[PDB]
């Protein structure tokens, strides 16, 4: 269709919407996107006619967003405002709570403290602290500004009853609405806090910033953080109550329109946006002020595909919002969800949880990407990953708590292992095959975005070629998780929607996959030093595995030479950061808890798998685990992804950034960049 039908709230934002159609008409040509303009009563009546296809793109602040996700409207955000620069666009903000130095308390110490808020009901000034307060608050908690009053000692919470909770204004008598209250707003609350009144301003942390001339100023106040220590203002990325989107275009899920409506906006930023039109302004207007986008706009940015509304609010920010929207609390360690990639390592983890005592239980998805999005947003708390992914999970947020250790030892629990060891193994028959020509042969792969299967060795092809369309390169292969036109499909065996799924549907994921690859269509194979041994001389007993002889198969030296498989130790590709276990950092010490307590019953201190439970069940397709683990291992200070991969690995994954086609990993960098 080409038209984007854009929804207005008032009279005023629908006749902007009618200029902004007339304008566009005038400069973009008939092949190109156009505007119809909607108009309805509210934002809540928008969200309804976008989700019943009445019309397609509505701006809105991160509470209407998330309204706008839940059902039956399953909206999704699709298009950013940002408010920087081209070169530095500021698409969030971050929910602070700052106070003085020095004045000796934390966030789990706020009650019977000053509170300065920007305004009742407000986000940042309200909704997202008191969201994140709400079961620390007394019961009962509806009317919530009783509850808080009964909090505070004493606040200024602009445009709330006085007469009815006159606690809340001892800071600003009355609680004045408008701006002539001097602690009024986003301003006023930090120099309420400025001036000693209250102890602590929930504001954005461009409000520190923007009150504040230097470092040397800023650094005479502190940020309050979740786990209830300090950190300073400059850290508030690493120090905030939420992660907030400033305003977002948000569209249908399925059908949305999400590309026409891409392509609107970003033609109209080119012609009409800052600075680019003294005809037409997108982002101003003689009707009144934040008509359709904030006047306060630079530009737009596309919302990365991946990306669904849970998602680009943040974990902490729905959490807040659920709290008070739902108006109910909940009453030791929650029970760990643990998230199985798909049915194969469901059912090995329906019997880890029925074999638990209750403290594990379980939930499904279809790739690793899936699985961390859902430890993410709490569908999920934790999963063992391949060190590439352990990569992406960090810039996700997640934190790795305990690894995967897999060389025998009296002390395994507490030995920090080097790595593994990434391979090239190629058949010894095909006595051509070089380190320096694989051009036009055939790979196998364990699955995209993995150490030895893909990052270390198309790591090490990048650099040789510096192009990533590692498809032409090589002839055909099996890379589970790539693009399904992908040549690198081609080799894989999965039967109909499995083909080329990265997970155990696709009989070539994996390193015993990516080995079979290699016996039965492939030239080489990328997995781990460990692998054929794993998988010949009967140790693995499937009819394609039976009969192969370590000795039929020789790795790849980086030297152009070759040896057995025995010799990873000088003829392998890189080391490989062991594979570890993630979480989110407010599940991390009860997953490193309840993890060493289920390795006790059920790690290698098991005789007889056959009769009991064994987490680490060496069977073909490490499921969960991989199954020469001999033990989960603990991490000591090396617990962000950057501290566990160390610097060799990161800047090593950092080089194939420009191939990545991780839709995750595009996400989560564009919500921390
Ligand atoms: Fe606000
Ligand atoms: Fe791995």
Same mark, same amino acid.
């Given at each position: 269709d080409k038209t984007v039908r854009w929804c207005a709230v008032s009279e005023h934002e629908a006749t902007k919407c009618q200029s902004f159609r007339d304008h566009m008409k005038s400069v973009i040509p008939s092949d190109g996107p156009s505007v119809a303009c909607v108009k309805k009563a509210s934002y809540l009546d928008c969200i309804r006619a976008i989700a019943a296809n009445e019309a397609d793109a509505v701006t809105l602040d991160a509470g209407l967003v998330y309204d706008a996700y839940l059902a039956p409207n399953n909206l999704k955000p699709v298009v950013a405002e940002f408010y920087g620069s081209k070169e530095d666009p500021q698409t969030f903000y971050y929910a602070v709570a700052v106070v003085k130095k020095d004045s000796g308390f934390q966030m789990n110490q706020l009650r019977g403290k000053k509170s300065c808020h920007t305004g009742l009901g407000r986000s940042a000034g309200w909704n997202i602290p008191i969201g994140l307060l709400y079961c620390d608050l007394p019961e009962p908690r509806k009317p919530l500004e009783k509850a808080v009053a009964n909090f505070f000692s004493g606040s200024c919470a602009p445009c709330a009853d006085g007469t009815d909770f006159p606690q809340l204004c001892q800071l600003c008598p009355g609680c004045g609405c408008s701006t002539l209250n001097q602690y009024f707003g986003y301003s006023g609350a930090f120099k309420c806090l400025k001036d000693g009144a209250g102890d602590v301003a929930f504001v954005k942390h461009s409000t520190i910033f923007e009150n504040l001339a230097n470092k040397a100023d800023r650094d005479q106040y502190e940020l309050l953080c979740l786990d209830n220590t300090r950190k300073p203002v400059d850290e508030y990325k690493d120090c905030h109550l939420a992660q907030v989107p400033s305003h977002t275009v948000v569209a249908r899920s399925m059908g949305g329109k999400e590309d026409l409506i891409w392509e609107l906006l970003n033609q109209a930023q080119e012609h009409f946006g800052k600075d680019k039109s003294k005809e037409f302004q997108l982002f101003s207007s003689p009707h009144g002020k934040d008509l359709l986008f904030k006047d306060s706009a630079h530009g737009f940015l596309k919302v990365p595909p991946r990306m669904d509304a849970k998602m680009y609010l943040g974990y902490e920010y729905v959490t807040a919002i659920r709290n008070l929207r739902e108006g109910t609390c909940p009453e030791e360690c929650k029970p760990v969800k643990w998230c199985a990639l798909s049915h194969h390592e469901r059912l090995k983890c329906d019997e880890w949880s029925v074999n638990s005592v209750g403290k594990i239980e379980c939930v499904s998805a279809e790739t690793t990407e899936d699985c961390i999005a859902k430890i993410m947003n709490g569908e999920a708390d934790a999963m063992s990953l391949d060190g590439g992914f352990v990569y992406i999970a960090g810039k996700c947020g997640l934190v790795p708590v305990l690894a995967e250790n897999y060389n025998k030892s009296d002390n395994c629990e507490d030995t920090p292992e080097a790595g593994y060891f990434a391979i090239a193994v190629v058949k010894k028959s095909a006595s051509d095959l070089t380190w320096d020509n694989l051009k036009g042969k055939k790979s196998c792969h &364990? #699955?995209?975005?993995? &150490? #030895?299967?893909?990052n270390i060795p198309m790591g090490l092809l990048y650099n040789k070629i510096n192009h990533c369309r590692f498809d032409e390169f090589f002839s055909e292969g099996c890379a589970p998780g790539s693009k399904k036109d992908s040549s690198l499909c081609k080799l894989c065996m999965g039967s109909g929607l499995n083909l080329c799924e990265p997970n155990n549907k696709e009989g070539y994921y994996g390193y015993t996959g990516a080995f079979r690859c290699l016996v039965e269509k492939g030239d080489v194979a990328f997995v781990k030093h460990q692998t054929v041994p794993q998988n010949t001389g009967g140790k693995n007993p499937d009819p394609w595995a039976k009969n192969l002889n370590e000795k039929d198969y020789e790795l790849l030296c980086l030297d152009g030479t070759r040896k057995p498989?025995?010799?990873?130790?000088?003829?392998?590709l890189a080391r490989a950061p062991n594979h570890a276990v993630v979480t989110r950092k407010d599940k991390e010490a009860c997953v490193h808890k309840i993890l060493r307590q289920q390795q006790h019953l059920?790690?290698?201190?098991?005789?007889?798998c056959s009769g009991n439970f064994c987490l680490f069940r060496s069977e073909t397709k490490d499921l969960l685990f991989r199954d020469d683990t001999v033990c989960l291992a603990k991490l000591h200070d090396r617990n962000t992804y950057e501290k566990y991969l160390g610097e060799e690995y990161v800047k090593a994954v950092g080089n194939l950034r420009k191939c990545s086609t991780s839709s995750l990993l595009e996400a989560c960098t564009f919500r921390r960049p």
């Open positions: &364990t #699955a995209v975005g993995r &150490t #030895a299967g893909w498989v025995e010799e990873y130790a000088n003829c392998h059920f790690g290698s201190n098991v005789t007889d």
